[PDB]
Enzyme design. Sequence first.
Site, PDB file in Angstrom:
ATOM      1  N   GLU A  95      67.990  45.322  31.791  1.00  0.00           N
ATOM      2  CA  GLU A  95      67.736  45.753  30.397  1.00  0.00           C
ATOM      3  C   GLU A  95      67.221  44.677  29.485  1.00  0.00           C
ATOM      4  O   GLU A  95      67.507  44.646  28.258  1.00  0.00           O
ATOM      5  CB  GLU A  95      69.056  46.306  29.811  1.00  0.00           C
ATOM      6  CG  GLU A  95      69.953  47.114  30.769  1.00  0.00           C
ATOM      7  CD  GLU A  95      71.095  47.777  30.085  1.00  0.00           C
ATOM      8  OE1 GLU A  95      72.143  47.194  29.871  1.00  0.00           O
ATOM      9  OE2 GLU A  95      70.881  48.948  29.695  1.00  0.00           O
ATOM     10  N   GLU A  96      66.420  43.753  30.039  1.00  0.00           N
ATOM     11  CA  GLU A  96      65.929  42.644  29.192  1.00  0.00           C
ATOM     12  C   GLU A  96      64.464  42.355  29.257  1.00  0.00           C
ATOM     13  O   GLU A  96      63.897  41.794  28.313  1.00  0.00           O
ATOM     14  CB  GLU A  96      66.651  41.339  29.667  1.00  0.00           C
ATOM     15  CG  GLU A  96      68.168  41.441  29.816  1.00  0.00           C
ATOM     16  CD  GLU A  96      68.788  40.307  30.586  1.00  0.00           C
ATOM     17  OE1 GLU A  96      68.236  39.832  31.566  1.00  0.00           O
ATOM     18  OE2 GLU A  96      69.907  39.918  30.159  1.00  0.00           O
ATOM     19  N   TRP A 115      68.054  49.502  21.826  1.00  0.00           N
ATOM     20  CA  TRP A 115      68.375  49.247  23.244  1.00  0.00           C
ATOM     21  C   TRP A 115      67.065  48.991  23.967  1.00  0.00           C
ATOM     22  O   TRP A 115      66.016  49.376  23.422  1.00  0.00           O
ATOM     23  CB  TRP A 115      69.162  50.475  23.799  1.00  0.00           C
ATOM     24  CG  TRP A 115      70.053  49.997  24.915  1.00  0.00           C
ATOM     25  CD1 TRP A 115      69.867  50.178  26.247  1.00  0.00           C
ATOM     26  CD2 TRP A 115      71.246  49.219  24.770  1.00  0.00           C
ATOM     27  NE1 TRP A 115      70.879  49.596  26.942  1.00  0.00           N
ATOM     28  CE2 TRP A 115      71.730  48.982  26.067  1.00  0.00           C
ATOM     29  CE3 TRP A 115      71.942  48.716  23.680  1.00  0.00           C
ATOM     30  CZ2 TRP A 115      72.887  48.252  26.309  1.00  0.00           C
ATOM     31  CZ3 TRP A 115      73.106  47.992  23.912  1.00  0.00           C
ATOM     32  CH2 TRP A 115      73.578  47.777  25.210  1.00  0.00           C
ATOM     33  N   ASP A 160      63.635  46.404  32.834  1.00  0.00           N
ATOM     34  CA  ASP A 160      64.174  46.244  34.213  1.00  0.00           C
ATOM     35  C   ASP A 160      65.631  46.734  34.255  1.00  0.00           C
ATOM     36  O   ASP A 160      66.248  47.065  33.213  1.00  0.00           O
ATOM     37  CB  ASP A 160      64.008  44.746  34.521  1.00  0.00           C
ATOM     38  CG  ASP A 160      64.882  43.850  33.669  1.00  0.00           C
ATOM     39  OD1 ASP A 160      64.879  43.983  32.417  1.00  0.00           O
ATOM     40  OD2 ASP A 160      65.563  42.988  34.257  1.00  0.00           O
ATOM     41  N   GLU A 171      82.675  42.154  35.829  1.00  0.00           N
ATOM     42  CA  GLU A 171      81.220  42.079  35.914  1.00  0.00           C
ATOM     43  C   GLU A 171      80.861  40.679  36.470  1.00  0.00           C
ATOM     44  O   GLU A 171      80.201  40.593  37.521  1.00  0.00           O
ATOM     45  CB  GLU A 171      80.489  42.246  34.603  1.00  0.00           C
ATOM     46  CG  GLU A 171      78.967  42.240  34.638  1.00  0.00           C
ATOM     47  CD  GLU A 171      78.330  42.434  33.291  1.00  0.00           C
ATOM     48  OE1 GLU A 171      78.422  41.417  32.561  1.00  0.00           O
ATOM     49  OE2 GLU A 171      77.777  43.474  32.987  1.00  0.00           O
TER      50      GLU A 171
HETATM   51  C1  LIG Z   1      74.851  45.706  28.419  1.00  0.00           C
HETATM   52  C2  LIG Z   1      73.590  44.832  28.390  1.00  0.00           C
HETATM   53  O1  LIG Z   1      73.818  43.871  27.374  1.00  0.00           O
HETATM   54  C3  LIG Z   1      72.787  42.945  27.107  1.00  0.00           C
HETATM   55  O2  LIG Z   1      71.665  43.545  26.547  1.00  0.00           O
HETATM   56  C4  LIG Z   1      71.662  44.375  25.434  1.00  0.00           C
HETATM   57  C5  LIG Z   1      72.033  43.680  24.108  1.00  0.00           C
HETATM   58  O3  LIG Z   1      73.397  43.206  24.151  1.00  0.00           O
HETATM   59  C6  LIG Z   1      71.911  44.736  22.953  1.00  0.00           C
HETATM   60  O4  LIG Z   1      72.360  44.177  21.716  1.00  0.00           O
HETATM   61  C7  LIG Z   1      70.480  45.355  22.927  1.00  0.00           C
HETATM   62  O5  LIG Z   1      69.503  44.406  22.602  1.00  0.00           O
HETATM   63  C8  LIG Z   1      68.389  44.868  21.812  1.00  0.00           C
HETATM   64  C9  LIG Z   1      68.676  44.362  20.389  1.00  0.00           C
HETATM   65  O6  LIG Z   1      69.877  44.965  19.841  1.00  0.00           O
HETATM   66  C10 LIG Z   1      67.438  44.512  19.487  1.00  0.00           C
HETATM   67  O7  LIG Z   1      67.790  43.978  18.183  1.00  0.00           O
HETATM   68  C11 LIG Z   1      66.206  43.833  20.140  1.00  0.00           C
HETATM   69  O8  LIG Z   1      65.077  44.211  19.404  1.00  0.00           O
HETATM   70  O9  LIG Z   1      66.011  44.276  21.477  1.00  0.00           O
HETATM   71  C12 LIG Z   1      67.119  44.207  22.362  1.00  0.00           C
HETATM   72  C13 LIG Z   1      66.664  44.841  23.706  1.00  0.00           C
HETATM   73  O10 LIG Z   1      66.193  43.760  24.543  1.00  0.00           O
HETATM   74  O11 LIG Z   1      70.265  45.923  24.213  1.00  0.00           O
HETATM   75  C14 LIG Z   1      70.276  45.035  25.320  1.00  0.00           C
HETATM   76  C15 LIG Z   1      69.993  45.935  26.550  1.00  0.00           C
HETATM   77  O12 LIG Z   1      68.659  46.366  26.433  1.00  0.00           O
HETATM   78  C16 LIG Z   1      72.387  42.178  28.399  1.00  0.00           C
HETATM   79  O13 LIG Z   1      71.208  41.355  28.236  1.00  0.00           O
HETATM   80  C17 LIG Z   1      72.129  43.166  29.559  1.00  0.00           C
HETATM   81  O14 LIG Z   1      71.840  42.500  30.778  1.00  0.00           O
HETATM   82  C18 LIG Z   1      73.351  44.078  29.730  1.00  0.00           C
HETATM   83  N1  LIG Z   1      73.198  45.033  30.814  1.00  0.00           N
HETATM   84  C19 LIG Z   1      74.298  45.013  31.795  1.00  0.00           C
HETATM   85  C20 LIG Z   1      75.245  46.159  31.669  1.00  0.00           C
HETATM   86  C21 LIG Z   1      75.148  47.340  32.353  1.00  0.00           C
HETATM   87  C22 LIG Z   1      76.275  48.357  32.265  1.00  0.00           C
HETATM   88  O15 LIG Z   1      77.116  48.170  33.432  1.00  0.00           O
HETATM   89  C23 LIG Z   1      74.208  47.466  33.549  1.00  0.00           C
HETATM   90  O16 LIG Z   1      73.589  48.763  33.555  1.00  0.00           O
HETATM   91  C24 LIG Z   1      73.065  46.425  33.486  1.00  0.00           C
HETATM   92  O17 LIG Z   1      72.317  46.378  34.701  1.00  0.00           O
HETATM   93  C25 LIG Z   1      73.621  45.018  33.193  1.00  0.00           C
HETATM   94  O18 LIG Z   1      72.570  44.008  33.225  1.00  0.00           O
END
Ligand SMILES: C[C@H]1O[C@H](O[C@H]2[C@H](O)[C@@H](O)[C@@H](O[C@H]3[C@H](O)[C@@H](O)[C@H](O)O[C@@H]3CO)O[C@@H]2CO)[C@H](O)[C@@H](O)[C@@H]1N[C@H]1C=C(CO)[C@@H](O)[C@H](O)[C@H]1O
Length: 470
Positions: A178-179, A119, A175, A399
């Site tokens: 989460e990206e 994550w 941020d 969403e």
């Molecule tokens: C829920 C979240 O989903 C997206 O981001 C997730 C990926 O879907 C998820 O697979 C993971 O990514 C990591 C990946 O697995 C790993 O192999 C790689 O090394 O690094 C990645 C981390 O960058 O985790 C990310 C989240 O860090 C979307 O891109 C996000 O925008 C999305 N967030 C949503 C959902 C929620 C819940 O309501 C809100 O808190 C948030 O503000 C919103 O943007």
Amino acid sequence: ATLDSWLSNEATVARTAILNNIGADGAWVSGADSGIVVASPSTDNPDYFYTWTRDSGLVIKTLVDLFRNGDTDLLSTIEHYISSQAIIQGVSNPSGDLSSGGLGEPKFNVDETAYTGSWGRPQRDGPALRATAMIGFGQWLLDNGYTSAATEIVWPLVRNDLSYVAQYWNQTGYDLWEEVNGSSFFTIAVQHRALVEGSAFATAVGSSCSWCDSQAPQILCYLQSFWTGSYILANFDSSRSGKDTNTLLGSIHTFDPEAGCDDSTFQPCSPRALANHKEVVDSFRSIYTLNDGLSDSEAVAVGRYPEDSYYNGNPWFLCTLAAAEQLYDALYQWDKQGSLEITDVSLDFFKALYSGAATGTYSSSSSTYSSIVSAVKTFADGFVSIVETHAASNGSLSEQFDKSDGDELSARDLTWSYAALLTANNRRNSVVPPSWGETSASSVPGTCAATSASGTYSSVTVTSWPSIVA
Ligand SMILES: C[C@H]1O[C@H](O[C@H]2[C@H](O)[C@@H](O)[C@@H](O[C@H]3[C@H](O)[C@@H](O)[C@H](O)O[C@@H]3CO)O[C@@H]2CO)[C@H](O)[C@@H](O)[C@@H]1N[C@H]1C=C(CO)[C@@H](O)[C@H](O)[C@H]1O
Ligand SMILES: *[C@@H]1O[C@H](CO)[C@@H](O[C@@H]2O[C@H](CO)[C@@H](O[C@@H]3O[C@H](CO[C@H]4O[C@H](CO)[C@@H](O)[C@H](O[C@H]5O[C@H](CO)[C@@H](O)[C@H](O)[C@@H]5O)[C@@H]4O)[C@@H](O)[C@H](O[C@H]4O[C@H](CO)[C@@H](O)[C@H](O)[C@@H]4O[C@H]4O[C@H](CO)[C@@H](O)[C@H](O)[C@@H]4O[C@H]4O[C@H](CO)[C@@H](O)[C@H](O)[C@@H]4O)[C@@H]3O)[C@H](O)[C@H]2NC(C)=O)[C@H](O)[C@H]1NC(C)=O
Ligand SMILES: *[C@@H]1O[C@H](CO)[C@@H](O[C@@H]2O[C@H](CO)[C@@H](O[C@@H]3O[C@H](CO)[C@@H](O)[C@H](O[C@H]4O[C@H](CO)[C@@H](O)[C@H](O)[C@@H]4O[C@H]4O[C@H](CO)[C@@H](O)[C@H](O)[C@@H]4O)[C@@H]3O)[C@H](O)[C@H]2NC(C)=O)[C@H](O)[C@H]1NC(C)=O
Ligand SMILES: *[C@H]1O[C@H](CO)[C@@H](O)[C@H](O)[C@@H]1O
Ligand SMILES: *[C@H]1O[C@H](CO)[C@@H](O)[C@H](O)[C@@H]1O
Ligand SMILES: *[C@H]1O[C@H](CO)[C@@H](O)[C@H](O)[C@@H]1O
Ligand SMILES: *[C@H]1O[C@H](CO)[C@@H](O)[C@H](O)[C@@H]1O
Ligand SMILES: *[C@H]1O[C@H](CO)[C@@H](O)[C@H](O)[C@@H]1O
Ligand SMILES: *[C@H]1O[C@H](CO)[C@@H](O)[C@H](O)[C@@H]1O
Ligand SMILES: *[C@H]1O[C@H](CO)[C@@H](O)[C@H](O)[C@@H]1O
Ligand SMILES: *[C@H]1O[C@H](CO)[C@@H](O)[C@H](O)[C@@H]1O
Ligand SMILES: *[C@H]1O[C@H](CO)[C@@H](O)[C@H](O)[C@@H]1O
Ligand SMILES: *[C@H]1O[C@H](CO)[C@@H](O)[C@H](O)[C@@H]1O
């Protein structure tokens, strides 16, 4: 006409839908522990059946405000949240333990177990947001004669979160979306706020937050670096333009009704926040087919950032609501002040709505003022109409909404969408949140230092809640 009545109706729906998403009696989230706010009941494509510190913090702060305004039945929901956080704080997870970084962990399972997969962690806004939500409840307990609950339960919990913010604010992380791994405006803004109200709360209970006091001014100092001369940079360490509703959120979630149009704190009516407002919104005008045909003085469907590709990059209900809430907030501020000012920084913003706009000070009795405020209100309401247009017939907020046809997509019944609805309605009706002390915490030090302060950590155990009556 359509709008006022739709809001009245939607507000009721929004309150109910949030309750259905909170354990352990929430109708949509059987499995969630007591006081666990679930992001969405969607367990598959996407899977949002988790509890995020951010989402929960934002949701609860909203419920706290409703509660303080007379929605007394929300008492047990808030008590349950607090109890659950006492447990979560102590859950050992990929970001660490209570005293070694655990507080930064983005999300957990609804059963209060750690989420151990990959994550974008840590997310440092979380602790700040949870603290702000608890402090609000803590204040009510003090005011209503439940000092013990405030001093022994709330304070100790807040103290953990304040210590984390003071300790790591000056470190990178992800941020709110989460990206992006870097330094984010939203995060910094909510962290400065948390420390300031954390300090006042500490004093109120007969304690102190020395680390709140030394660090807040430094976070503020740093915050200034996000202004580029024309808009607020969403994040440092990014290859994007930097235009992001992250900046609108930072402003509305740090709005202080007692504050003037302060640039240092990026208040809703500050010239910097208004110029930023136009630059952000404008960035979505030509990329969504749903926006085809609208003019520059017309409200549009707003997404997160123009470069977004999540689910293809679509407008978001909460991003669209935030564009309106910032305006509602600025209207309240101008009215309370009895004037509005147009500066070179904010001219484009005003000129797009009122072509006869010119720099100067306009008193609330002036013709210019009447003309600007009506235009601002109509624009603000326009964002809300886009929401009403794309909500499901029963009031369900998703969403996202399709960039082309406006159909709802991604997580259904997103709790955050519902809280955003409530706050925008509230502001629209001039219902503002309690002040956080911005008036004594907007002075910027002459020299910014890259520093921290270590507070203290201690595990809280909630044996019993006093028999509170509201
Ligand atoms: C829920 C979240 O989903 C997206 O981001 C997730 C990926 O879907 C998820 O697979 C993971 O990514 C990591 C990946 O697995 C790993 O192999 C790689 O090394 O690094 C990645 C981390 O960058 O985790 C990310 C989240 O860090 C979307 O891109 C996000 O925008 C999305 N967030 C949503 C959902 C929620 C819940 O309501 C809100 O808190 C948030 O503000 C919103 O943007
Ligand atoms: C306005 O009206 C709306 C229209 O009716 C209404 O929305 C509907 O609400 C019902 C719930 O009342 C939803 O039912 C759920 O449907 C799930 C399947 O959804 C997919 O398939 C549907 C059919 O083809 C699609 O329509 C649906 O699309 C929607 O969702 C998409 C994704 O978010 C979204 O993109 C779309 O736009 C669209 O909005 C989706 O594609 C189904 O799985 C789910 O069943 C669970 O819940 C039941 C109880 O609520 C249980 O009885 C059942 O057994 C399942 O339980 C599991 O999941 C629960 C969480 O939801 C847990 O609480 C349970 O414990 C259990 O979890 C186990 O499994 C998990 C596996 O991942 C695991 O994590 C757990 O630990 C545990 O092991 C339910 O039937 C319906 O989808 C909604 N329809 C739409 C179109 O949105 C809306 O609510 C109304 N609004 C208002 C304000 O009233
Ligand atoms: C910990 O705290 C310290 C102290 O507050 C922080 O240090 C400050 O960091 C900021 C940001 O780096 C720095 O500001 C830069 O100053 C340079 C010159 O003085 C500028 O060249 C630089 O410009 C970028 O930001 C501008 C807006 O301020 C934009 O107009 C400009 O286009 C630049 O933006 C692009 O490039 C950046 C690169 O930094 C990129 O990340 C962006 O995405 C964008 O593409 C900044 O203005 C201060 O000078 C520092 N102050 C001191 C006293 O050292 C430190 O950053 C903190 N660290 C963490 C991790 O929180
Ligand atoms: C924000 O607070 C500062 C003091 O920290 C004031 O000087 C300013 O006017 C605003 O009230
Ligand atoms: C306003 O107040 C801050 C502290 O909040 C100082 O650091 C600044 O120099 C100014 O006096
Ligand atoms: C960061 O820097 C400040 C002042 O420069 C210190 O007081 C603090 O202890 C930390 O080292
Ligand atoms: C926060 O980080 C600073 C680094 O500037 C340390 O000096 C401090 O002790 C705390 O770890
Ligand atoms: C920061 O450092 C202090 C010591 O000054 C610890 O007590 C705290 O837990 C954190 O590690
Ligand atoms: C930091 O400070 C708290 C409060 O005084 C202690 O309880 C903790 O153990 C640590 O020493
Ligand atoms: C640190 O402080 C907490 C909160 O009062 C206590 O529960 C713990 O025993 C330690 O003293
Ligand atoms: C504080 O932290 C301890 C573990 O360090 C937990 O047992 C307790 O539940 C609370 O979360
Ligand atoms: C609250 O208090 C209990 C002791 O009654 C601890 O075991 C727990 O970790 C937390 O400090
Ligand atoms: C209830 O009881 C436990 C055990 O003494 C405490 O740790 C808790 O803080 C509360 O007083």
